Amino acid sequence: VQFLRTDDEVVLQCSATVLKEQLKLCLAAEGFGNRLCFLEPTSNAQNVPPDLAICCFTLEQSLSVRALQEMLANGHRTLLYGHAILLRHAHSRMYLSCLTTSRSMTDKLAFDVGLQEDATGEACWWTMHPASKQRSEGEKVRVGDDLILVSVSSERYLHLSTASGELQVDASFMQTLWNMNPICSCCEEGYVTGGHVLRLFHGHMDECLTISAADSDDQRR
Amino acid sequence: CGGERYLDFLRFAVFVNGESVEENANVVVRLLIRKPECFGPALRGEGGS
Amino acid sequence: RLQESISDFYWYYSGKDVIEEQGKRNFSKAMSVAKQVFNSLTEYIQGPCTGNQQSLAHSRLWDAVVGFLHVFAHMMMKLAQDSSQIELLKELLDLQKDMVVMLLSLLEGNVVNGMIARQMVDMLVESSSNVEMILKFFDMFLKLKDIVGSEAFQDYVTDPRGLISKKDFQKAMDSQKQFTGPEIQFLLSCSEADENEMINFEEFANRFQEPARDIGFNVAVLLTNLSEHVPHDPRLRNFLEL
């Protein structure tokens, strides 16, 4: 029953439920050499571990619509419906935004979602809405609750297009529920946490499990 | 033929004295884009020509 | 819902330098309705009704309280500088007094380390900033009434009629060290920008004191009650220090 707050990392997983599989794919983007986002499957982790290093988005700022308009004209905060939020990619340090390019020829109104390196403008700001009938605007959101996100720059949803048989995320006029699952919320201070890079050391000055150099006969194996 | 009447009433509501009412126009366009079924078979979704 | 509407009105009118008379009328009506609502709530729990007190404690009252504090913290200092908004400011102060009374009633009949007291402490630490702004606004104006008896400012008073030049009044604050540099500009703005740099510190430091005396006393009583009934509360001692 915990409420999502800023300065937290989220995966933003969308439950496709294709062929009664509930893959719950999550959006990801490299940020360098490619700006467009794409869904990677978070299911079937036993047979193959899916990458999640590029699937972390930090909640940078949260603001209301009127205050957002005023600052555009110009410390944890509880997230509630009808509020504008800012998402920053963990690895790329860029901001999630709605690009004006439309690579999808199936829908003329569709817009592609990608990463941008500047926080200026309203293209990178998004607002959640109470997709559930029980919930209503002005109510604080909680973990394990489906959400619907709309660009403040242009009314559109993170629709999960699957017309071509491939799951893509794009700004469209059709509604789509999104699960805002938080990760890395409970910081283990001084303790070792998941999704962390480090140098293991049997003792000191060890280089534990250090792979061989490049172009070696070991083939880095 | 059914849509003709509503479209005429909407243009009368939005346009007065050769100028466009900004509030009415914004509300109408927001509702129209919220419910794309008002755009007819074409100009709607992937199947719209 | 009323608090959300008033917050939206504040966010709309924040940019404008001067509030339009129609907006003033709408604010007056909204704050009158809000004042009536609070009185009803106080009546519900004024008699030590434990069930009603628990129901209010487990409710969304605290979010509305935080929002009202946020609106107030900017309303006081926005309406202070202008000279045509004194009535609206006084009505706002009366509404804030009622808010405190309701909170005190809520605090009525508490025990040591009580759940309602802890909830009030959590509310205060959630809305610390606005409370700090309100407390500062009160204390520097009390010191403003104190400055009239200061010799280090009376000597700087030059006009036989008793008027003090703007620059001289800045230097007097800086010498007395009552108010810091950023606060100096706010006091200058709130001062009656008289046609001359000479300003009537008399009125500037004698106004806003009657309507603020009652609400300041209520705030002091609330803080004293919380401090005495919640031992070992470092955040509460931080508020007391402020």
From Swiss-Prot, chain C:
It comes from the Eukaryota. Residues 151-179 form the EF-hand domain. Detected in skeletal muscle (at protein level). Fast- or slow-twitch skeletal muscle. Ca(2+) binds at E43. Homotetramer. Can also form heterotetramers with RYR2. Identified in a complex composed of RYR1, PDE4D, PKA, FKBP1A and protein phosphatase 1 (PP1). Repeated very high-level exercise decreases interaction with PDE4D and protein phosphatase 1 (PP1). Interacts with CALM; CALM with bound calcium inhibits the RYR1 channel activity. Interacts with S100A1. Interacts with FKBP1A; this stabilizes the closed conformation of the channel. Interacts with CACNA1S; interaction with CACNA1S is important for activation of the RYR1 channel. Interacts with CACNB1. The calcium release channel activity resides in the C-terminal region while the remaining part of the protein constitutes the 'foot' structure spanning the junctional gap between the sarcoplasmic reticulum (SR) and the T-tubule. Pore opening is mediated via the cytoplasmic calcium-binding domains that mediate a small rotation of the channel-forming transmembrane regions that then leads to channel opening. Belongs to the ryanodine receptor (TC 1.A.3.1) family. RYR1 subfamily. Cytosolic calcium-activated calcium channel that mediates the release of Ca(2+) from the sarcoplasmic reticulum into the cytosol and thereby plays a key role in triggering muscle contraction following depolarization of T-tubules. Repeated very high-level exercise increases the open probability of the channel and leads to Ca(2+) leaking into the cytoplasm. Can also mediate the release of Ca(2+) from intracellular stores in neurons, and may thereby promote prolonged Ca(2+) signaling in the brain. Required for normal embryonic development of muscle fibers and skeletal muscle. This is Ryanodine receptor 1. It comes from Oryctolagus cuniculus (Rabbit). The chain holds residues 3925 to 4166 of 5037 of the full protein.
